[PDB]
Amino acid sequence: ASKRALVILAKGAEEMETVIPVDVMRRAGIKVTVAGLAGKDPVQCSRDVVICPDASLEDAKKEGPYDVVVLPGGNLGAQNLSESAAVKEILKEQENRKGLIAAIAAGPTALLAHEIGFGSKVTTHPLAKDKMMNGGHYTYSENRVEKDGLILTSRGPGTSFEFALAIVEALNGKEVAAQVKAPLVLK
Amino acid sequence: ASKRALVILAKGAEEMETVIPVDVMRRAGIKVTVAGLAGKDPVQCSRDVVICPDASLEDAKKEGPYDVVVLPGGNLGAQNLSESAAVKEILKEQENRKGLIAAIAAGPTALLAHEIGFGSKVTTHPLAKDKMMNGGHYTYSENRVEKDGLILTSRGPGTSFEFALAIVEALNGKEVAAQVKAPLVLK
Numbered sequence: 001a002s003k004r005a006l007v008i009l010a011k012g013a014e015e016m017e018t019v020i021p022v023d024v025m026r027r028a029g030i031k032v033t034v035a036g037l038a039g040k041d042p043v044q045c046s047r048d049v050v051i052c053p054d055a056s057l058e059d060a061k062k063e064g065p066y067d068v069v070v071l072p073g074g075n076l077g078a079q080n081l082s083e084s085a086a087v088k089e090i091l092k093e094q095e096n097r098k099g100l101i102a103a104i105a106a107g108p109t110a111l112l113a114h115e116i117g118f119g120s121k122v123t124t125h126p127l128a129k130d131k132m133m134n135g136g137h138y139t140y141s142e143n144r145v146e147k148d149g150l151i152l153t154s155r156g157p158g159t160s161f162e163f164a165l166a167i168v169e170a171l172n173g174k175e176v177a178a179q180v181k182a183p184l185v186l187k
Numbered sequence: 188a189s190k191r192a193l194v195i196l197a198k199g200a201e202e203m204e205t206v207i208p209v210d211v212m213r214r215a216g217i218k219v220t221v222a223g224l225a226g227k228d229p230v231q232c233s234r235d236v237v238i239c240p241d242a243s244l245e246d247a248k249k250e251g252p253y254d255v256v257v258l259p260g261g262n263l264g265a266q267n268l269s270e271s272a273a274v275k276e277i278l279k280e281q282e283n284r285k286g287l288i289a290a291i292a293a294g295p296t297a298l299l300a301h302e303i304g305f306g307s308k309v310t311t312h313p314l315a316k317d318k319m320m321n322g323g324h325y326t327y328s329e330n331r332v333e334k335d336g337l338i339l340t341s342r343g344p345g346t347s348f349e350f351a352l353a354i355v356e357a358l359n360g361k362e363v364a365a366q367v368k369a370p371l372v373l374k
Contacts, residue, residue, distance in 0.1 A: 019206045023234040023344070034236070042229070042239050047210040049221070052229055052237040125372065144374065157210070158373030161345065185312065185331070186345030187374065 003030050003171040006066040008087060009053050010037035012076025015045035016157040017104050021070055024164035027180045028172050030067075035060035037080060037087070046074040057086055067171050069094045073105025073125060073156065082113035091116045095150070100170055104154040104163050108132055117151040125156045161186055190217050190358040193253040195274060196240050197224035199263025202232035203344040204291050208257055211351035214367045215359050217254075222247035224267060224274070233261040244273055254358055256281045260292025260312060260343065269300035278303045282337070287357055291341040291350050295319055304338040312343045348373055 005025050009018060018034075025032050036043055036053035043051050054060075069090060071081055081087050091114050094101055103111060105125040109132050111117055118137045123146040133140055144159045145166045146152070152170065154163035161184065169177040192212050196205060205221075212219050223230055223240035230238050241247075256277060258268055268274050278301050281288055290298055292312040296319050298304055305324045310333040320327055331346045332353045333339070339357065341350035348371065356364040 014210075015206050016203075016210050019202050019236055020344075022236055023201075023203050026234045047213045048241075049206055049209055050239040052239060054235075125370075127370075144372070156370070156372035157207075158348065158371040183314075183343070184345040185343035187331075 003067040005030050005032045005068045005070060005167070006060060006064070006090075007032060007034050007070040007072065008037055008057060008081060009034055009043050009051065009072065010077045010080035011043055012074050012080060013043065013045050013072045014074035014077065014105060014157060015047055015049040015051065017074065017107070017160050018045065018051065018072040020160035021072070021104075021164040021167065024161065024180060025167060028168040028176055030168070030171060033060050033063070033066075037084060046077065061086065061090060064093075065097060065099060066094070068100040068102055068167055070167070071101070071103035071107040071110050073107040075106050078106035078109050078128075081107070081110040088114040098150060100150050100152060100167070102152040102163070102167050104160065105156045108153045111151070112137060120148040120151040122146055122148065122151060122153040123155055124153065190254040192217050192219045192255045192257060192354070193247060193251070193277075194219060194221050194257040194259065195224055195244060195268060196221055196230050196238065196259065197264045197267035198231055199261050199267060200230065200232050200259045201261035201264060201292060201344060202234055202236040202238065204261065204294070204347050205232065205238065205259040207347035208259070208291075208351040208354065211348065211367060212354060215355040215363055217355070217358060220247050220250070220253075224271060233264065248273065248277060251280075252284060252286060253281070255287040255289055255354055257354070258288070258290035258294040258297050260294040262293050265293035265296050265315075268294070268297040275301040285337060287337050287339060287354070289339040289350070289354050291347065292343045295340045298338070299324060307335040307338040309333055309335065309338060309340040310342055311340065
């Protein structure tokens, strides 16, 4: 069967960090569900791009489990994810079931807020490092993409393709990742 | 005295090739208008991402002129742009006023359809080369980003950041382009 991905979209999310992973995962044959944190209504991203989710998080939550839960970045978006009780429950369940969790840029700070994967080696956007490291619950890395077991993190818009392809490789293998990468015309 | 950009969004547009330039140009302080070819309704992109435009092309065309007209890629999206009489007029007017025109991936094939910038050195996604070169009205290039005068072209999702930063440099200068680039965490 095909793998399934849950992408949680909140107001203030970085649209590039949201669209690149959604697009690339779909190119990989992954069934991606773009779920709106606040509901079914369209979401105004950080640079004012308006994206309409496939469904509300409340409804997508009932259609689990997912092979990967993806948390986009964006300072305000990540803050909304960090303050969400629904997100806390989703991440704890994913962590418990040994499912992959992927967060990019400011996105990883949501893991800290919900006490997810403590002890993991992680990376974040440079400007989110201090927030992520508050309390020293993680070990910091400057790698563009960092994968420690079931916790996959990345740094920013410019690492979004690498981040997405890492998710594809983790779920569908290196072969599929290479096949999906070629047509993108990456460096 | 901010610059203005018009991004024409049609069904089937490559969402990454649309969102990356929109986001990056806004980071550059450019006033970007995402105009829906078909109207004000949300647009279903190539990988099913739904984006709601800022306005319809019909209304956006009335608020011209723009310092740059941007044509996203996506096979089906570029086809729709190529068939549009409204797009033909907008591009001819921009070319006449000596304004910048930027197209990425399959996007440049719309230039051929509307007989824009013949004689220019251009690039496209590899799979769109034959279509673009039908009749030999352009000279092909494999450069990731090609700029011949007021005709700026690029190759695909993976060259979207380079494409967007080239637009920023052309409109706001290399200083601003560098400032905008740094926080993106590009390789």
